[PDB]
């Protein structure tokens, strides 16, 4: 089967998106496959972080990959704790615990 994930990438983050494609081709299987939906955004604009988030919750993704900054870290953790969707990130860790 084919599963759907969402991607949130900063503008200017060339190498990580290049590192994202190398990971997909190598860790692909024949049985189950992952389908990304990539979005490019400014990451300090928490409107755009919100706008990219709710657009991909409309898609019905299973998990979300993305980054966050200081401006948007509270935006994600309040959303993923509420809307119960998982978020995987290479950003700096949140102080305290967040589901």
């Amino acid at each position: 089967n084919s599963i759907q994930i969402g991607g949130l990438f900063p503008r200017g983050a060339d190498q990580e998106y290049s590192a994202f494609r190398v990971g997909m081709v190598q860790f692909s299987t024949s049985e189950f496959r992952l389908t990304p939906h990539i979005d490019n955004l400014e990451v300090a604009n928490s409107f755009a972080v919100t706008n990219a988030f709710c657009s991909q919750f409309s898609r019905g993704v299973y998990a979300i990959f993305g980054f966050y900054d200081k401006k948007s870290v509270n935006t994600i953790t309040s959303f993923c704790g509420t809307l119960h969707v998982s978020f995987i990130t290479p950003s700096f860790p949140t102080d305290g615990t967040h589901p």
Partner: protein, 49 residues
Amino acid sequence: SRRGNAGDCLANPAVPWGQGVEIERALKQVQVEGLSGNIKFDQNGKRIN
């Protein structure tokens, strides 16, 4: 009086409405007296004097 319907906040692209620019210029150009004292603003929105 923007009686045109504002719609949602999740517009693609999200569009402003230029009478909102009219509002904050009135809000910054207010110097009245209240409980704390002289209420004088900046162009930013912070208080001075």
